[PDB]
Amino acid sequence: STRVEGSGGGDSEVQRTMLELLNQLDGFETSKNIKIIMATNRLDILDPAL
Amino acid sequence: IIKGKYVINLKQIAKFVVGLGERVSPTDIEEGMRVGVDRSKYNIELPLPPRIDPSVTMMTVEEKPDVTYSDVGGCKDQIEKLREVVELPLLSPERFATLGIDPPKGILLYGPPGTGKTLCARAVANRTDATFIRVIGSELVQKYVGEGARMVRELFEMARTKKACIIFFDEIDAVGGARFDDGAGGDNEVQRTMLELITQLDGFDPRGNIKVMFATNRPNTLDPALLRPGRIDRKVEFSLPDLEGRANIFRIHSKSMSVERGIRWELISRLCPNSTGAELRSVCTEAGMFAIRARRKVATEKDFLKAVDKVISGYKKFSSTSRYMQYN
Amino acid sequence: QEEEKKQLEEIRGNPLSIGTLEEIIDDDHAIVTSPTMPDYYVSILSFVDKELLEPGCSVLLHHKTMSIVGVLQDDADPMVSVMKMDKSPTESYSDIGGLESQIQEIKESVELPLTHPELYEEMGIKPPKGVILYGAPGTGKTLLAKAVANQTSATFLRIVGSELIQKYLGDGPRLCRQIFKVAGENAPSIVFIDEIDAIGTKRYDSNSGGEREIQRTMLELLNQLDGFDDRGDVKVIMATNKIETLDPALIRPGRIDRKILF
Amino acid sequence: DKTENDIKALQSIGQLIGEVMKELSEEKYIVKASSGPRYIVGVRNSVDRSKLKKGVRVTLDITTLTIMRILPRETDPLVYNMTSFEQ
Amino acid sequence: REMFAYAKEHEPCIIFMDEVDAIGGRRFSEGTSADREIQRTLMELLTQMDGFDNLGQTKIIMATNRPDTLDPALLRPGRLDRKVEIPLPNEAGRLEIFKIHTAKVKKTGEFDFEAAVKMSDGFNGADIRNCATEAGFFAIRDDRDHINPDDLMKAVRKVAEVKKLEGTIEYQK
Amino acid sequence: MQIFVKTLTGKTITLEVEPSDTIENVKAKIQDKEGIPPDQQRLIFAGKQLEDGRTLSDYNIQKESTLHLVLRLRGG
Amino acid sequence: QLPYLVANVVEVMDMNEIEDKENSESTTQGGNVNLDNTAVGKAAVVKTSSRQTVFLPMVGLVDPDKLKPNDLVGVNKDSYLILDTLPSEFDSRVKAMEVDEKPTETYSDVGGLDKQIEELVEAIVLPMKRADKFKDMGIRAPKGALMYGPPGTGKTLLARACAAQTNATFLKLAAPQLVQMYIGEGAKLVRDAFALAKEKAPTIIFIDELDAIGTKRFDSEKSGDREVQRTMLELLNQLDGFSSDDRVKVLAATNRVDVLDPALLRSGRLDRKIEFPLPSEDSRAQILQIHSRKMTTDDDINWQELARSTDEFNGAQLKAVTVEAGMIALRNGQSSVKHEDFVEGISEVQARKSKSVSFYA
Amino acid sequence: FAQLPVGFKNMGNTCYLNATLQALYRVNDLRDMILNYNPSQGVSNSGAQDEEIHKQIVIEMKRCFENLQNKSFKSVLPIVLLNTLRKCYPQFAERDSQGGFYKQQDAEELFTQLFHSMSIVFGDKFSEDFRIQFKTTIKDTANDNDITVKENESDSKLQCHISGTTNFMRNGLLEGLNEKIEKRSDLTGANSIYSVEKKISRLPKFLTVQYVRFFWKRSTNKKSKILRKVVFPFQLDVADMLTPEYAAEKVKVRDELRKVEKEKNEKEREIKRNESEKDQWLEEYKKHFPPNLEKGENPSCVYNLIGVITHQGANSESGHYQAFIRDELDENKWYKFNDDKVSVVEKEKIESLAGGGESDSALILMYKGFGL
Ligand SMILES: Nc1ncnc2c1ncn2[C@@H]1O[C@H](COP(=O)(O)OP(=O)(O)OP(=O)(O)O)[C@@H](O)[C@H]1O
Ligand SMILES: Nc1ncnc2c1ncn2[C@@H]1O[C@H](COP(=O)(O)OP(=O)(O)OP(=O)(O)O)[C@@H](O)[C@H]1O
Ligand SMILES: Nc1ncnc2c1ncn2[C@@H]1O[C@H](COP(=O)(O)OP(=O)(O)OP(=O)(O)O)[C@@H](O)[C@H]1O
Ligand SMILES: [Mg+2]
Ligand SMILES: [Mg+2]
Ligand SMILES: [Mg+2]
Ligand SMILES: [Mg+2]
């Protein structure tokens, strides 16, 4: 209840790390296969890095 | 110790009464001392140094950095005050027996950022030939509270056994800071190590030839029981350079740099406001990058002016240009 | 080859019980604590060169009586798993093309002293260390860091700044202290901290995070960037855009030499 | 006699305590030891089936692991320290 | 677990838990791993008290130093049927306690207790016994083996001065 | 003749001997009262060793003197 | 002779001696008349540090009036039989609390503040020695005396000086060390610090810094200060009277008196409450003169003039004037401490440089 | 490449000799006198026929030392010397069962025997060089009724008697030059306890202090070895074991020499950024030496550390002595002599030899007079 005022969610901290790896992860064997499917009630609670 | 055999705890935890073999005498075994014993029959085979818990009190011990005392940080009278408290009673206790005073041990290094407090304890590490033990105060905190209490005690008593060492308490604004009570907080676990710093220093005897330097980068975060000066003897504020002090500092840097002489180092101090000693340390390296664009081997008068402006506009963009973290 | 292995195996096992090295004694001995349990007061066969090993190493002990036959070197942890690269960039330089008029203060302090130590011999003194990149987002900072790494061929570690925030206390500084000791071990490395404004805005719970967790990690990173250690060459790349949540002991010039605006 | 009694204890050996966790068969009992791991163990004709119930402590040998006798319950070393407070 | 079993082996076994605060505390579990031992132990107590084991022979006295420190299952009466309040003494309830400790001392006779003790208020019951001790420190000063009224009226006054140091404000329901 | 022998524990005991007696008698007498065996004993005086074949007048060894006893150790 | 294990006696249950017709045991045996069949002699159950329990016929040489359900014994490892009895175990950190020829500092290192000393002697030392008069009086023993007041007042130094001077056993204990994450055995460090003390009685448990186990809180939520207080409550258990706190005492120094536990405010825990002041006019001059006793001085000094220019400094600040006098003397290049250099050590160190730029003050 | 001296190859069961010789040759007068030997050096004549065996031994040191200094060599033979020693003392000439060869014992005894031989050849005037003279007062505890003054008591090295009184070397030296003598003699009383204090009345120019490490266990009846940590200062000051008079003389000379020693240690570092420069300072140093100086005396009460014999492994009954000597050209540079394996080690390696444990620990410490 202070992590939603503290970081937008403590699960959004893990999500945000994830997404930043993926910005330059387009080639590792050359092409993307592992997609990050994120999901939420509404997207107004997401971080501006998402 | 049972007087005439001893009770040992193996590290497989299992306890045994053991005697004395033929490498051991009546006087070799002490409390909390390790001993090696035989696995077919338990008997003291070889006495051993105390305590296997040390392994992260050995990651704060390293050997000395050999940086000279001919290039140092700050060209004031401030380092000679260090030379009376830290350095000289290590070199010569003869003068302090003639005075008759209890030799001087402690000192605080406090004041503005960027003033080369770590540069002078590295400079002293070459000169005195005394073992250096350097501490991060923020590595003293562990999730499971009570672990860092153990930690401090072990380092400090081990150091009384060493002779002629300096312990540099670095970054103890965390543990060594303020103290206060909460009502549902979680600060209190950290304060445990704060309390253990008060009680090892003061001891139940005084320090056994441990000269202590404490580097605080804010003179505003210190326990109010190391603020009292009885254990921290004369305490010398490392402040920002003077207008003559900046000229000296820039001359060490430019004798070490390849230049054309006939460059004023006084002028450069004038353009600057009162600001860190580290700015003048980056004037030269940016003047060195302007060397390469200009296709030089030297830095000449002109491009130092450009570099001086770069750093100054930097301090304009930020702060701590006359801040003390508020309140000298 | 034939005569070498005869007398090598004479003391080298069959099973070679693993130890972890707590401390050595200067008489050709050590005191090991095994991961299995029992400690042992081991000797040293000493054809692995007594002064070549040190605490934290994993050691080969002999299965008749435990003597240090040898020493394993090269380890990995679940804590350097996080750091190490799991890709090699497939977008190389000038796929950040445009805004290329201040890429000259990142290709003449990061790339170059590795490429030519020659030009920094002519001037002598300290080379450039560190850059901080800042501007609005969309100036390519995050890939720029990974593209100057391509050119130099120095060990590029990359650590996100939301993994330097943990939901446990005191073990944060311990993770951050590690990162630069790894880097100096490679004689050239580049460490990119992605979003070092994410250690001064992020927290978990307030009883193992809070102000304090943030505060400590900043202070730790000062000693790592320089302090007393005097480690090897680490070039540092920081991308940030909130440059007022940091200690006024890292954003001073004289550590991170040129600061670049975009 | 003070030393004769010591001989008789010495040439004997210790017992290792269990308790009857579950009856399996006539001559086979499942116990859970006070040291831990469960065993299947036997019985002498020094104990009856009508004299054993569960949670009743039993002796075992440390050289054959067979019950010879019924053993009273155990009770903490810790809780005996509490009965010695009355002041 | 074995302590409740033992209480059933031993008719009328009476169990004082002394100073429960942080071994029967709340769910906590955002601090140390130590906080999961608290739970684990706490469940044990309730399962003995209530289930296919029920205690009517055998009695629980739970002594706690601040009422609202405990898990709500320990605030659920049925294991803990009475929540008895033992007051901080009343004006003239201090007289009642003073009279039992004035028979512990050797004296030359005193029956002038009532006025002073009534308006020396601020005492708990142990401070009556410490007013005995401080009168025996005044006594040693005068070179006496006895308590007199010259010791007594100074004793209650002194102990009062030192207890102004800090107070005790804890909620009483 | 009364002489003094400083033991390994640095405590001085007395010994009653003769200046004509050999070092083997001296060492035998310390064996009786301490248990130490002669062939591990070394009696020193003046920083000079007194061998088994010597006596206690070869080096002018009279009374009120202290010999310093130290013990042997093998290897090579 | 070695080896032999070290154990505790779980309980004693006691089987009959061999003189009956029907077994020599308290339990019943399958099969009747037996006297040496499968019935054994007197029994004790002991717990081995190899971590099991063994039911043994206890050695007849070891009298069963020596066994207690809580006593530490020898057990022969090879075949588990009580060999002997041994004194009770203590943890290694608790064995170094003892004196080892502790130096005294006596009242010759203390000038000024006599009143404090007097209270200390009356509280601690005399109820030990004059413990009969105390029973005559008809009162109960003190469990300890508190010392409090600002940092640097001299508390720690007193405690050492008096305990060595009168020869009462001084246990050296520091509060955070009892807080360990072995808790239960780290709480047993507390238990054993009393266990040692009851054998080594009368004794003074000087705990330096009492704001770790003297915390205000015992209502804590969602944090690990609930680990911390479990070593506080065990101490308060051994200051509840089941005696073992009647000659076993406590000195405590604390630097902050605002956060002390309400169960330590009460008497029966800490009873005598000694304030340590800011020194008076005269007292400051005495303090200076105690540090100057060791070293050389000129005979043109006057401690009263010095006490004018010091304004209610406490003892740490006055130590830092007397040493700083002799800093300056070495710095000029003498070795004779000038009577003028006391004056300059007062200004040089006040534990503060200047009074912070004035521009409207 | 660089200049480094040669060592002895251990035959096996010989190290007790090889280890000791190295330390002795560091001593400046020692190496000099063996070189400048003539077959015309005055002997301490009172007769005796082993004076002639002593001559032969000194020739063997001279040629060992010539081999050692010259590079046409990588191994120095002890074989001729071993043969001479076995003739000289017939305790080294026995035979072990199930072990083998010629009896192996004792670097302490060996240094004693070597100085004995040298003092016969080079006279009693050479005996004074390492010999210490004491002032001994033998005096009753309370009022004196029987008193004797001994200066004829003497030694050639100190015996630091460990009894668990060591954590520092000085303490154990002080409690083994302090003692209580119990008597078994008739006075007008008997068994009077006498306090004896020996104080040094003449410093040696070369100091040796040996740690005593052995004990006879009487509770098992078998030899053990004491193991203890004893820090030894490189710079040793013996002021407290001298009488006030003698201490006053040497401490005043010491403080002036420490002024010139300080002045060198500053100048050395500057010129960096050698032998001749030391000689320019030597001519300055000798001027502060007292005008009443005599033969076989340190001009100071301070000594510096030039050798440590270490003994490693398990029990006594066993031993392989390696040794540390300090370079003769340096002052913080030490050579490790592990038979013919010669290497440079630093100050930190010397510090580590304080001991305790199965590790290297000290038995003998060689110093020498004149601070620097
Ligand atoms: N006075 C100075 N002269 C020359 N260089 C300096 C000076 N002060 C700082 N520097 C430069 O800055 C670098 C880092 O400074 P350092 O790590 O010593 O910080 P600090 O002064 O202790 O401050 P803080 O406590 O605020 O971190 C040094 O390695 C040095 O090159
Ligand atoms: N100025 C630019 N020119 C070309 N490509 C750009 C530019 N800015 C961003 N990009 C592209 O956008 C993608 C991600 O940008 P990157 O993460 O490197 O930038 P950033 O500045 O750190 O911040 P952000 O991700 O929020 O844009 C990459 O495909 C990168 O090439
Ligand atoms: N009356 C006095 N006379 C002489 N010296 C004094 C006096 N009072 C204090 N001192 C000196 O001041 C020093 C500091 O006080 P001390 O450290 O003993 O107590 P403390 O208040 O418990 O401090 P802390 O908790 O910070 O260790 C003493 O060690 C002593 O040197
Ligand atoms: Mg800092
Ligand atoms: Mg971005
Ligand atoms: Mg204190
Ligand atoms: Mg109570």
The amino acid present at H131, given as its one-letter code, is R
Q: How many Cβ atoms sit within 10 Å of the Cβ of residue B190?
A: 21
Classify the C-alpha dihedral B187-B189-B192-B194 as positive or negative: negative
Q: Is G284 in the pocket of ligand 3 (CB under 6 A)?
A: no
The amino acid present at B303, given as its one-letter code, is D
Backbone φ, ψ for residue H66 (5° rounding):
-70, -45
Residue G294 is nearest to which of B100, B145, B185, comparing CB atoms? Answer: B100
Closest residue by Cα to atom 19, ligand 3, is G154
Backbone φ, ψ for residue F33 (5° rounding):
-95, -15
Q: How many Cβ atoms sit within 10 Å of the Cβ of residue C212?
A: 24
Please, what's the b/e burial string for G299-315 (b: 16 or more CB within 10 A of its CB; e: otherwise)?
eebebeebbeebeebbb
Residue C146 is nearest to which of A7, A24, A28, comparing CB atoms? Answer: A24
Q: Is C246 in the pocket of ligand 2 (CB under 6 A)?
A: no
Q: How many Cβ atoms sit within 10 Å of the Cβ of residue C202?
A: 24
What does the alpha-carbon distance between residue C166 and residue C173 come to, in Å, rounded to a whole number?
Answer: 10
Which residue, G318, B194, B178, F35, is CA-closest to H219? F35
What does the alpha-carbon distance between residue H252 and residue H301 come to, in Å, rounded to a whole number?
Answer: 10
Rounded to 5°, the CA angle G260-G261-G263 comes to 135
What does the alpha-carbon distance between residue C249 and residue G311 come to, in Å, rounded to a whole number?
Answer: 38
DSSP secondary structure letter of residue C23: E
Q: Which two tokens mark H49?
A: 């026929």
Chain C residues touching G223 at Cβ < 8 A: 207
Residue G178 near residue B256, CB atoms below 8 Å: no
Q: Where are the beta strands (DSSP E) in chain E?
A: 14-17, 59-62
Using CA atoms, how far residue H58 sits from F50, G200, H24, H35, in Å, is 21, 64, 13, 9
Residue B256 near residue C124, CB atoms below 8 Å: yes
Closest listed ligand to the CA of G233: 7
What does the alpha-carbon distance between residue C79 and residue C178 come to, in Å, rounded to a whole number?
Answer: 9
Residue G246 near residue G203, CB atoms below 8 Å: no
Kind and range of the H or E element at F68? strand F66-71
Q: How many Cβ atoms sit within 10 Å of the Cβ of residue G274?
A: 21
Q: Which residues, 6 or more positions from H372, have their beta carbon under 8 angstroms from its beta carbon?
A: H261, H264, H304, H331
Backbone φ/ψ region at E78: left (φ over 0), alpha (ψ -120 to 50), beta: left
Q: Which two tokens mark D27?
A: 């001559």
What is the distance in A from the centroid of ligand 6 to the CA of B195? 10
Alpha carbon E98 to its chain centroid, in Å, reads 17
Q: Is B243 on the interface with C (CB under 8 A)?
A: no
* Alpha helix (H) residue ranges in chain C: 2-5, 112-115, 119-122, 141-152, 171-185, 210-225
Backbone φ/ψ region at G157: left (φ over 0), alpha (ψ -120 to 50), beta: alpha
Is residue G68 packed enough to be buried (19+ CB in 10 Å), middle (13-18) or exposed (0-12)? Answer: middle
Q: How many Cβ atoms sit within 10 Å of the Cβ of residue H367?
A: 23
Chain C residues touching B315 at Cβ < 8 A: 252-253
Q: Is E8 on the interface with G (CB under 8 A)?
A: no
Using CA atoms, how far residue G343 sits from G295, G305, G347, G349, H140, in Å, is 17, 9, 7, 11, 53
What does the alpha-carbon distance between residue F56 and residue F46 come to, in Å, rounded to a whole number?
Answer: 13
Q: Is F35 on the interface with H (CB under 8 A)?
A: yes
Q: Is E167 on the interface with C (CB under 8 A)?
A: no
Backbone φ, ψ for residue H331 (5° rounding):
-145, -15
Q: Which two tokens mark G54?
A: 């063994």
The amino acid present at C213, given as its one-letter code, is E
Which residue, G318, G303, G325, is CA-closest to G350? G318
Residue B263 near residue B301, CB atoms below 8 Å: yes
Q: How many Cβ atoms sit within 10 Å of the Cβ of residue B168?
A: 23
What does the alpha-carbon distance between residue B227 and residue B229 come to, in Å, rounded to a whole number?
Answer: 6
Closest residue by Cα to atom 7, ligand 2, is C140
Closest residue by Cα to atom 17, ligand 1, is C227
Please spell the DSSP secondary structure of D25-76, one letter per residue.
SSS-EEEEESSS--EEEEE-TTS-STT--TT-EEEEESSS-EE-SEE-----
Give catalytic residues of H, as residue numbers. Answer: 15, 320
Write out the residues surrounding ion ligand 4, Cβ under 5 A: B 171, 217
Is residue C161 packed enough to be buried (19+ CB in 10 Å), middle (13-18) or exposed (0-12)? Answer: buried
Q: Is B4 on the interface with H (CB under 8 A)?
A: yes
Residue in this structure with the two tokens 């030891």, named with its chain if needed: D33
- Cβ of H357 and C26 within 8 Å? no
Closest listed ligand to the CA of B223: 3
Please spell the DSSP secondary structure of G45-108, one letter per residue.
EEEETTTEEEEEE--TTS-TTS--TT-EEEE-SSS--EEEE-PPP--HHHHSSS-SSPPP-TTT
Q: How many Cβ atoms sit within 10 Å of the Cβ of residue F55?
A: 18
Closest residue by Cα to atom 21, ligand 3, is G152
Kind and range of the H or E element at G215? none
Please spell the DSSP secondary structure of D4-39, one letter per residue.
HHHHHHHSS--EEEEEEEEE-SSS-EEEEESSS--E
| DSSP-derived 3-state class of residue C178 | helix
Q: Which residues, 6 or more positions from H151, have their beta carbon under 8 angstroms from its beta carbon?
A: H133, H134, H135, H136, H201
Residue H104 is nearest to which of F6, F70, F76, comparing CB atoms? Answer: F76
Which residue, C182, C201, C178, is CA-closest to C190? C182
Which residue, B23, H351, H93, is CA-closest to F73? B23
What does the alpha-carbon distance between residue H99 and residue E101 come to, in Å, rounded to a whole number?
Answer: 84
Is residue H142 packed enough to be buried (19+ CB in 10 Å), middle (13-18) or exposed (0-12)? Answer: exposed
Residue G169 near residue G125, CB atoms below 8 Å: no
Q: Which residues, 6 or more positions from H272, have their beta carbon under 8 angstroms from its beta carbon?
A: none
Residue in this structure with the two tokens 């199930």, named with its chain if needed: H98
Per CATH, which fold does F1-76 belong to?
Ubiquitin-like (UB roll) (3.10.20)
Chain E residues touching B144 at Cβ < 8 A: 32-34
Backbone φ, ψ for residue G90 (5° rounding):
-135, 150
Q: Is B104 in the pocket of ligand 1 (CB under 6 A)?
A: no
Q: Is B111 in the pocket of ligand 1 (CB under 6 A)?
A: no
Which residue, H320, H307, H302, H318, is CA-closest to H360? H320
Kind and range of the H or E element at F28? helix F23-34
| DSSP-derived 3-state class of residue C124 | strand
Residue G340 near residue G348, CB atoms below 8 Å: no
Q: Which two tokens mark H325?
A: 């000597």
Residue B186 near residue G224, CB atoms below 8 Å: yes
Which residue, H43, D81, B265, E60, is CA-closest to G191? D81
Q: Is C219 in the pocket of ligand 1 (CB under 6 A)?
A: no
Kind and range of the H or E element at B130? none
Peptide bond connecting G3 to the previous residue in cis, omega within 30 degrees of 0: yes
* 3 state SS for chain H: CCCCCCEECCCCCCHHHHHHHHHHHHCHHHHHHHHCCCCCCCCCCCCCCCHHHHHHHHHHHHHHHHHHHCCCCCEECCHHHHHHHHHHCCCCCCECCCCCCECCCCHHHHHHHHHHHHHHHCCHHHHCCCCEEEEEEEEECCCCCCEEEECCCEECCEEECCCCCCCEHHHHHHCCCEEEECCCCECCCECCCEEEEEEEEECCCCCEEEECCEEEECCCCEEEECCCCCECCCEEECHHHECHHHHHHHHHHHHHHHHHHHHHHHHHHHHHCCHHHHHHHHHHHHHHCCCCCCCCCCCCCEEEEEEEEEEECCCCCCCEEEEEEECCCCCCCEEEEECCEEEEECHHHHHHHHCCCCCCEEEEEEEEECCC
Which residue, C112, C9, C122, is CA-closest to C63? C9
Using CA atoms, how far residue C7 sits from B325, C17, G159, in Å, is 67, 20, 66
What does the alpha-carbon distance between residue G41 and residue G65 come to, in Å, rounded to a whole number?
Answer: 16
> Where do the domains of chain F lie?
1-76
The amino acid present at C153, given as its one-letter code, is S
Is residue B23 packed enough to be buried (19+ CB in 10 Å), middle (13-18) or exposed (0-12)? Answer: buried
Residue in this structure with the two tokens 């002090």, named with its chain if needed: B245
What does the alpha-carbon distance between residue G296 and residue G289 come to, in Å, rounded to a whole number?
Answer: 11
Contacts made by residues C20-23, CB under 8 angstroms, sequence distance 24+: C20/C56, C20/C57, C20/C58, C20/C59, C21/C53, C21/C54, C21/C55, C21/C56, C21/C57, C21/C58, C21/C59, C21/C71, C22/B52, C22/B55, C22/C55, C23/B54, C23/B55, C23/B58, C23/C55
Classify the C-alpha dihedral H55-H57-H58-H59 as positive or negative: positive
Classify the C-alpha dihedral G96-G101-G107-G112 as positive or negative: negative
What does the alpha-carbon distance between residue B314 and residue B322 come to, in Å, rounded to a whole number?
Answer: 14
Is residue B295 packed enough to be buried (19+ CB in 10 Å), middle (13-18) or exposed (0-12)? Answer: exposed
Exposure on the CB side of residue G111, measured as CA atoms within 13 A: 17
What does the alpha-carbon distance between residue B184 and residue C254 come to, in Å, rounded to a whole number?
Answer: 42
What does the alpha-carbon distance between residue H20 and residue H25 come to, in Å, rounded to a whole number?
Answer: 9
Q: Which two tokens mark G227?
A: 């680990």
* Alpha helix (H) residue ranges in chain G: 92-95, 114-120, 126-129, 131-137, 155-166, 175-178, 187-199, 225-237, 262-265, 281-294, 303-309, 315-332, 341-348
* 3 state SS for B38-54: CCCCCCEEEEECCCCCC
What does the alpha-carbon distance between residue H211 and residue H226 come to, in Å, rounded to a whole number?
Answer: 10
Q: Which of C143, C195, C237, C238 has the most ligand 2 atoms within 8 A of CB, as the residue to mutate?
A: C143
Which residue, D46, D50, D67, is CA-closest to D58? D67
Q: Which two tokens mark E64?
A: 């706690």
Backbone φ/ψ region at G151: left (φ over 0), alpha (ψ -120 to 50), beta: beta
Using CA atoms, how far residue B62 sits from B135, B167, E59, H247, in Å, is 10, 11, 61, 40
C57–chain B nearest CA distance, Å: 12
Backbone φ/ψ region at G333: left (φ over 0), alpha (ψ -120 to 50), beta: left
Q: Which residues, 6 or more positions from G184, have their beta carbon under 8 angstroms from its beta carbon?
A: none
